[PDB]
Every structure is written in C-alpha cells, then in structure tokens.
Coordinates of C-alpha atoms and ligand atoms in Angstrom, one line a residue:
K1 CA -48.7 -59.6 97.0
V2 CA -50.1 -57.0 94.3
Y3 CA -51.5 -53.6 94.5
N4 CA -54.4 -52.7 91.7
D5 CA -53.7 -56.0 90.0
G6 CA -49.8 -55.5 89.4
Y7 CA -50.3 -52.0 88.2
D8 CA -49.3 -50.2 91.4
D9 CA -46.6 -50.2 93.7
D10 CA -46.3 -49.9 97.9
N11 CA -46.3 -45.9 97.4
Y12 CA -49.8 -46.1 95.3
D13 CA -47.9 -44.9 92.2
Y14 CA -48.6 -46.4 88.6
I15 CA -45.7 -48.7 87.7
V16 CA -44.6 -46.5 84.4
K17 CA -43.5 -48.8 81.6
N18 CA -41.4 -47.5 78.6
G19 CA -43.1 -47.5 75.2
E20 CA -46.7 -48.4 76.9
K21 CA -49.8 -47.3 74.9
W22 CA -52.6 -45.8 76.9
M23 CA -56.2 -46.1 75.5
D24 CA -55.2 -46.5 71.8
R25 CA -53.7 -42.6 71.9
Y26 CA -51.3 -41.8 74.3
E27 CA -47.3 -43.5 73.8
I28 CA -45.6 -43.0 77.2
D29 CA -42.0 -41.9 76.7
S30 CA -40.3 -41.8 80.2
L31 CA -40.2 -40.6 83.8
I32 CA -39.8 -36.9 83.8
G33 CA -40.8 -35.9 87.4
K34 CA -41.7 -37.2 90.7
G35 CA -44.0 -36.1 93.8
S36 CA -46.1 -36.5 96.9
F37 CA -48.9 -35.8 94.4
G38 CA -47.9 -39.0 92.3
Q39 CA -45.9 -39.0 89.1
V40 CA -45.2 -37.0 85.8
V41 CA -44.7 -38.4 82.4
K42 CA -43.8 -37.2 78.8
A43 CA -45.9 -39.0 76.3
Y44 CA -47.0 -38.5 72.5
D45 CA -50.2 -37.5 71.9
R46 CA -51.6 -39.6 68.4
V47 CA -54.4 -37.7 68.3
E48 CA -53.4 -34.0 68.5
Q49 CA -49.9 -35.2 67.0
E50 CA -47.8 -33.5 69.7
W51 CA -45.7 -34.0 72.9
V52 CA -47.3 -33.8 76.2
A53 CA -46.6 -34.0 80.3
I54 CA -49.0 -36.1 81.8
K55 CA -49.3 -35.9 85.8
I56 CA -50.2 -39.4 87.1
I57 CA -52.0 -39.0 90.4
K58 CA -51.8 -41.7 93.0
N59 CA -54.5 -44.3 93.3
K60 CA -55.5 -43.1 96.5
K61 CA -58.7 -41.0 97.6
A62 CA -56.6 -38.2 99.5
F63 CA -54.3 -37.3 96.2
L64 CA -57.3 -37.8 94.0
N65 CA -59.6 -35.3 95.6
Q66 CA -56.8 -32.8 96.0
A67 CA -56.2 -33.3 92.1
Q68 CA -59.8 -32.7 91.4
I69 CA -59.5 -29.0 93.5
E70 CA -56.5 -28.6 91.2
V71 CA -58.3 -29.6 87.9
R72 CA -61.2 -27.1 89.0
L73 CA -59.0 -24.1 89.2
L74 CA -56.8 -24.9 86.0
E75 CA -60.2 -25.3 83.9
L76 CA -61.4 -21.9 85.6
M77 CA -58.3 -20.3 84.5
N78 CA -58.6 -21.8 80.7
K79 CA -62.1 -20.1 80.2
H80 CA -60.5 -16.6 81.2
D81 CA -57.1 -17.2 79.2
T82 CA -58.6 -18.9 76.2
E83 CA -55.9 -17.4 73.9
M84 CA -53.2 -18.3 76.4
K85 CA -51.3 -14.8 76.9
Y86 CA -51.3 -14.6 80.6
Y87 CA -48.6 -17.1 81.2
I88 CA -50.3 -20.0 83.1
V89 CA -49.7 -23.6 82.2
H90 CA -52.5 -25.0 80.1
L91 CA -54.7 -28.3 81.3
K92 CA -55.5 -29.7 78.3
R93 CA -58.1 -32.4 79.3
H94 CA -57.6 -35.4 82.1
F95 CA -58.9 -39.0 82.2
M96 CA -59.0 -41.8 84.3
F97 CA -56.8 -44.7 83.6
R98 CA -56.8 -47.9 85.9
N99 CA -57.8 -46.0 88.9
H100 CA -55.5 -43.2 88.4
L101 CA -56.4 -39.9 87.5
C102 CA -54.2 -38.5 84.6
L103 CA -53.9 -34.5 84.1
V104 CA -52.9 -33.9 80.5
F105 CA -50.6 -30.6 80.7
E106 CA -48.6 -28.9 77.6
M107 CA -45.0 -29.9 77.1
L108 CA -42.7 -27.5 78.5
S109 CA -38.6 -26.8 78.8
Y110 CA -36.5 -26.2 81.6
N111 CA -37.6 -24.8 85.0
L112 CA -35.5 -21.8 86.2
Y113 CA -33.8 -23.8 88.9
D114 CA -32.3 -25.6 86.1
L115 CA -31.1 -22.7 84.5
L116 CA -29.3 -21.3 87.6
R117 CA -27.8 -24.9 88.0
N118 CA -26.1 -24.2 84.3
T119 CA -24.4 -21.3 85.8
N120 CA -23.2 -22.9 88.5
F121 CA -25.8 -20.6 90.8
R122 CA -24.4 -17.5 89.8
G123 CA -27.4 -16.1 88.1
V124 CA -28.9 -14.6 84.7
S125 CA -28.7 -11.0 83.4
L126 CA -30.8 -8.3 84.3
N127 CA -32.3 -8.4 80.7
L128 CA -33.4 -11.8 80.9
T129 CA -34.4 -11.2 84.6
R130 CA -36.8 -8.3 83.4
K131 CA -38.3 -10.5 80.9
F132 CA -39.2 -13.1 83.4
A133 CA -40.4 -10.2 85.9
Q134 CA -42.5 -8.5 83.3
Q135 CA -44.2 -12.1 82.6
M136 CA -44.7 -13.0 86.3
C137 CA -46.5 -9.6 87.3
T138 CA -48.8 -10.1 84.0
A139 CA -49.6 -13.7 85.3
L140 CA -50.0 -12.2 89.0
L141 CA -52.3 -10.0 87.3
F142 CA -54.5 -12.6 85.5
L143 CA -54.4 -14.4 89.0
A144 CA -55.9 -11.0 90.6
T145 CA -58.9 -11.0 88.3
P146 CA -61.8 -10.4 90.6
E147 CA -63.6 -13.7 89.5
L148 CA -60.5 -15.9 90.0
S149 CA -58.9 -14.5 92.7
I150 CA -56.1 -17.3 92.9
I151 CA -53.4 -17.5 95.1
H152 CA -50.6 -19.9 93.5
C153 CA -49.3 -20.2 97.2
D154 CA -45.9 -22.0 96.4
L155 CA -44.2 -19.7 93.9
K156 CA -40.5 -20.8 93.3
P157 CA -38.1 -21.2 90.6
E158 CA -38.9 -24.9 90.0
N159 CA -42.6 -24.0 89.2
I160 CA -41.9 -21.5 86.5
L161 CA -40.7 -23.3 83.3
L162 CA -39.7 -21.9 80.2
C163 CA -42.2 -22.6 76.9
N164 CA -39.1 -23.5 74.6
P165 CA -35.5 -24.1 75.4
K166 CA -34.5 -21.4 72.8
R167 CA -36.9 -18.6 74.0
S168 CA -37.4 -16.2 77.0
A169 CA -41.4 -17.3 77.4
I170 CA -42.3 -18.7 80.7
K171 CA -45.1 -20.5 82.3
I172 CA -46.2 -20.9 85.7
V173 CA -47.0 -24.4 86.9
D174 CA -48.3 -26.5 89.8
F175 CA -51.3 -25.4 91.3
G176 CA -51.6 -28.2 93.6
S177 CA -51.1 -25.8 96.8
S178 CA -53.2 -23.3 95.3
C179 CA -56.4 -21.9 96.4
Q180 CA -58.9 -19.0 95.7
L181 CA -59.0 -16.0 98.3
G182 CA -61.1 -17.2 101.2
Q183 CA -61.6 -17.1 105.0
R184 CA -58.4 -18.6 106.5
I185 CA -57.9 -22.2 106.8
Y186 CA -54.4 -22.9 106.3
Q187 CA -51.2 -21.3 108.0
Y188 CA -47.9 -23.2 107.0
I189 CA -48.0 -22.6 103.4
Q190 CA -45.6 -21.7 100.8
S191 CA -41.8 -23.2 100.3
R192 CA -39.9 -21.5 103.2
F193 CA -37.4 -19.3 101.3
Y194 CA -40.2 -17.8 99.5
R195 CA -42.6 -17.5 102.4
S196 CA -44.1 -14.2 103.2
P197 CA -43.8 -12.5 106.7
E198 CA -47.4 -12.3 107.3
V199 CA -47.6 -16.5 106.8
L200 CA -44.6 -16.7 109.3
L201 CA -46.3 -14.1 111.9
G202 CA -49.6 -16.3 111.6
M203 CA -51.6 -13.3 110.3
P204 CA -54.0 -12.7 107.6
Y205 CA -53.0 -13.1 104.2
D206 CA -54.2 -12.5 100.4
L207 CA -52.8 -12.3 97.0
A208 CA -49.9 -10.3 97.9
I209 CA -47.9 -13.4 99.5
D210 CA -47.2 -14.1 96.0
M211 CA -46.0 -10.9 95.3
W212 CA -43.5 -11.3 98.1
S213 CA -42.3 -14.9 96.5
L214 CA -41.8 -13.2 93.0
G215 CA -39.6 -10.3 94.9
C216 CA -37.6 -13.2 96.4
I217 CA -37.4 -15.1 93.0
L218 CA -36.2 -12.2 91.1
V219 CA -33.4 -11.4 93.3
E220 CA -32.4 -14.9 92.9
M221 CA -32.7 -15.5 89.3
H222 CA -30.0 -12.6 88.9
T223 CA -27.9 -13.3 92.2
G224 CA -28.1 -17.0 91.6
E225 CA -28.6 -17.6 95.3
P226 CA -31.7 -17.6 97.2
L227 CA -32.2 -14.3 98.9
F228 CA -33.3 -15.6 102.1
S229 CA -32.1 -19.3 102.3
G230 CA -33.8 -20.1 105.8
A231 CA -33.1 -23.4 107.4
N232 CA -36.3 -23.0 109.6
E233 CA -38.9 -20.5 110.4
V234 CA -36.4 -18.3 113.0
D235 CA -33.5 -18.6 110.8
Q236 CA -35.8 -17.5 107.9
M237 CA -37.4 -14.4 109.9
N238 CA -33.5 -13.7 110.9
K239 CA -32.3 -13.7 107.3
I240 CA -35.4 -11.3 106.0
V241 CA -34.3 -9.1 109.0
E242 CA -30.8 -8.5 108.2
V243 CA -32.1 -6.9 104.7
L244 CA -35.1 -5.4 105.8
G245 CA -35.1 -4.4 109.3
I246 CA -37.3 -5.0 112.2
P247 CA -40.9 -5.3 110.8
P248 CA -43.1 -2.2 111.8
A249 CA -44.9 -2.0 115.4
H250 CA -48.2 -1.9 114.3
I251 CA -47.5 -5.6 112.2
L252 CA -46.0 -7.3 115.2
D253 CA -48.7 -5.8 117.7
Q254 CA -51.2 -7.7 115.6
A255 CA -49.2 -10.9 115.2
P256 CA -50.4 -14.2 117.2
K257 CA -46.6 -15.6 116.3
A258 CA -44.6 -12.3 117.0
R259 CA -43.0 -13.7 120.0
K260 CA -41.7 -16.8 118.2
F261 CA -39.0 -14.3 116.6
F262 CA -39.1 -11.2 118.7
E263 CA -39.5 -9.8 121.9
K264 CA -41.5 -6.9 123.1
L265 CA -39.8 -4.7 125.7
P266 CA -41.2 -2.6 128.6
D267 CA -41.4 0.7 126.3
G268 CA -43.4 -1.2 123.7
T269 CA -40.7 -1.7 120.8
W270 CA -39.8 -4.9 119.3
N271 CA -36.3 -6.6 119.4
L272 CA -35.2 -9.8 117.8
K273 CA -34.8 -12.7 120.5
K274 CA -31.1 -14.2 120.6
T275 CA -31.0 -18.1 119.3
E276 CA -24.5 -14.9 114.2
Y277 CA -26.6 -12.4 112.1
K278 CA -25.9 -9.0 111.1
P279 CA -27.8 -6.4 112.6
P280 CA -31.4 -5.3 111.3
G281 CA -31.3 -3.7 107.8
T282 CA -27.2 -3.9 107.3
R283 CA -27.3 -6.4 104.6
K284 CA -28.7 -3.9 102.2
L285 CA -30.1 -5.1 99.1
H286 CA -27.9 -2.3 97.2
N287 CA -24.9 -4.3 98.1
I288 CA -26.7 -7.5 97.3
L289 CA -27.4 -6.5 94.0
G290 CA -23.9 -4.6 93.5
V291 CA -25.6 -1.7 92.1
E292 CA -22.3 0.5 91.8
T293 CA -19.7 -2.3 91.9
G294 CA -20.8 -4.2 88.8
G295 CA -23.5 -6.5 89.6
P296 CA -23.2 -9.6 91.8
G297 CA -19.8 -10.7 92.1
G298 CA -18.5 -7.8 89.9
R299 CA -19.7 -10.4 87.3
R300 CA -21.8 -7.9 84.9
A301 CA -19.2 -5.1 85.1
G302 CA -19.4 -3.5 81.5
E303 CA -22.2 -5.5 80.3
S304 CA -25.0 -3.2 78.5
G305 CA -28.0 -3.2 80.7
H306 CA -26.4 -3.3 84.1
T307 CA -25.6 0.1 84.9
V308 CA -26.3 2.0 88.3
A309 CA -29.2 3.8 86.8
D310 CA -30.7 0.4 85.3
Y311 CA -29.9 -1.3 89.1
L312 CA -31.8 1.3 91.0
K313 CA -35.2 0.5 89.2
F314 CA -34.5 -3.3 89.8
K315 CA -33.9 -2.2 93.6
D316 CA -37.0 0.1 93.7
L317 CA -39.3 -2.5 92.4
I318 CA -37.8 -5.4 94.5
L319 CA -38.2 -3.3 98.0
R320 CA -42.1 -2.5 96.5
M321 CA -42.7 -6.3 96.1
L322 CA -40.7 -7.1 99.8
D323 CA -42.9 -4.8 101.5
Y324 CA -43.8 -5.9 105.1
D325 CA -47.3 -4.5 105.1
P326 CA -49.2 -6.6 102.4
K327 CA -51.9 -3.9 102.1
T328 CA -49.6 -1.3 100.8
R329 CA -47.2 -4.0 98.9
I330 CA -47.0 -3.5 95.1
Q331 CA -49.7 -5.0 93.2
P332 CA -49.5 -6.5 90.0
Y333 CA -51.1 -3.4 88.1
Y334 CA -48.8 -0.9 89.3
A335 CA -45.6 -3.1 89.3
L336 CA -46.1 -3.4 85.5
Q337 CA -46.0 0.2 85.1
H338 CA -42.7 0.5 87.0
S339 CA -39.4 2.5 85.4
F340 CA -37.8 -0.6 85.3
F341 CA -40.2 -1.9 82.6
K342 CA -39.5 1.1 80.7
Ligands
B7B401 C1 -39.7 -32.4 80.4 N1 -40.0 -31.8 81.6 C2 -39.0 -31.3 82.5 O1 -37.8 -31.9 82.4 C3 -38.6 -30.5 83.6 C4 -38.6 -28.9 83.4 C5 -38.4 -28.5 84.7 C6 -39.3 -29.3 85.5 C7 -39.6 -30.7 84.9 N2 -40.9 -31.0 84.5 C8 -41.9 -31.3 85.3 C9 -41.3 -32.2 86.8 C10 -42.5 -32.6 87.5 C11 -43.6 -31.3 87.6 C12 -43.0 -30.8 86.1 C13 -41.7 -30.6 83.2 N3 -43.0 -30.5 83.2 C14 -43.9 -30.0 82.0 N4 -45.2 -29.8 81.9 C15 -45.5 -29.5 83.4 C16 -46.4 -28.5 83.6 C17 -47.1 -28.5 84.4 C18 -47.2 -29.7 85.5 C19 -48.1 -29.5 86.4 N5 -47.7 -30.0 87.7 O2 -49.1 -28.4 86.6 C20 -46.5 -30.7 85.5 C21 -45.8 -30.9 83.9 N6 -42.8 -30.5 80.8 C22 -42.1 -30.7 80.7 C23 -41.3 -31.2 81.7

C-alpha cells in the first residue's frame, strides 16, 4: 500500500515534490538526476543563501552503507583540499531526512558529455582540451597524495562537470565507485569504454587505471567520439589492440584472463582469438587525431593552436597515458611537466 508512510515508491526512492521545504532550510526546485544510488535534486539553501545539489540516497541498507563510504572519502579529501584548488567536488554537509541520507554538494554546470552533445559529437578544441587535461592531471595528482591514495575508479565525461557554464573550470564528481588503494577486492570495475587493460586482463591495479581513463577521455573531448567504444570486453580489447597493438608478452604471461582475448602459440607469442578489426596497431592515433590533416574530420584546419607541432605534443602525452604497462604509465606529476602544457 505505502512505503515509508507514503514518502517512498516501490524503488525505495523519495517522491520528490516541487516547492517542498525540508527542515526550514532547503527549498526543493526539481529533479536534476537519477541513478542506482537514488536521486539528485536542485534546491536553494536558505541559510547559506545559494543553490546546491542534493543527492538523496534510497531508503535501503545497501545504498546507505555504500553512501557513507562515499561520505568518508569526500570529507577526507575536503580536509586536504580546504581552499578547493584541486578540482574535486565539494561535499558541504550531509543529513538524514525521513530515513533518506541526503548529501549536499555544490551546484555545478553542464557535464563534458553535454558539451560533446552540443557539438553533435564532433568535439571541442585542443585549447579547451588542454585546459581540461591540465585540471584532470592536477586532480589526479591530488588523488595520488599518499594519505589519500584514492582511485576514482569510474572516470568518464559525464562524471566531469564545469563549475560555471561560461568558464573552463571543472570539478570531478561521483565517488560512489571510488576506493582507496589496497588489496584487490573488486575486478569488474570502471565504465567499459574507459576500462584499463589490466582490469580487462584480471591483473593487479592501482592509481594508474584513472590515467588510462583520462587518456581515453581527452581524445574523446577532441574527436567527439569515444576512442574505444566496446560493446563487450572482447570488442573493448580488440578496439584497444587496433590502436596500440598486441599487449607485451611479459604482461600477457602474468594475466589470468589473457585467454579471453588472446591465444598463446607453441613458440610463446600471443595473437588475437578470432571472434572485422584492423590489424594490431594500424588504426594509428596520429590518423585518429589528424595531426597533419587539420584535426578530426579536417575541421580544425587553419585554427590557431592546431598545428602539426601542437598535435604531436598532445599525441605524445596520450600515448604515455595509454601505456599498456601501469608501472611505467605516466603519472600526474610528470604529465603536468609535459611539452603539451607549455
Ligand atoms: C544541474 N546539473 C545538471 O544539469 C547536470 C550537469 C551534468 C550532470 C547533472 N548533475 C547531476 C546528475 C546526477 C549527478 C550529477 C548536476 N550535478 C551537480 N552537482 C553534483 C555534483 C556531484 C554529485 C555527486 N554525485 O557527487 C552530485 C551532484 N550540479 C548540477 C547538476
């Protein structure tokens, strides 16, 4: 008949009403987001006198406990980034309201997927891509702080938002899938397009998987399309192989799930299993980027900052971010000193 005395639905979510006023403070405007966790709502904070984004968790033990883990990591990051200069979203406070946990985040603008949708998935400039890349590398450097050692674990364009609609400033959002460095508990992780080869191969992983995802994201911001748009793990691995070639022998020998995508021969070398795809390493990033042909689809020809010299610096940085080996894959600190950021 009713769930939580008529405040909830069958999905254990709060029935958001327009114009409702919680706790003589938050004035609820409208629903701005939906998810597995629950819902996200735009509201005016009458005490602080500002708009805020409130994430309302489902009235259910599982999501509550997972959200408290998120609350712990957000509050941990906030005490190390008190001046808010490392581009992580700010959890302002949290409260319980009619059995729902409510996280109050700051109000931000469009996500980077909405930005790509406005271009009809043709992408943004190398200059705007540089400003996003600088910011994400700074954010990843902050996550590498040894007391934090946080893996976001689900970096993608929809989890990167702009601060203001008329500025380039960004903040990373959604630490629900995030964890700190540790022993391996989880294996099916990250969104598929931005999923590192070590995750796909069932190998050990650390903070380098976020640098993989970043590499995939920065190409997508410029071209407009995902770099590796795999419909499944096999297709995902084959689309990586097209660009980067077959992974090294020493990695595949140490991979529990190598046989899912590859086939060891009598001589000891690894080929692809036939499931169609270009041969290994023949869909070059050089040609995807259009280094010499005026950028993606020749659309940047004649634009300032879109020369062969400029494109090579971006190309080089990305191939270091998309390094197959996570132990020699570029780190936030060195990535920030790359020629591309001069
Ligand atoms: C009005 N608006 C939107 O129109 C779009 C912008 C792209 C994503 C939309 N969202 C939420 C959709 C559900 C999760 C983010 C928005 N998020 C926020 N802030 C926010 C930041 C972090 C989190 C979180 N999950 O940690 C939630 C909300 N502020 C504004 C906002």
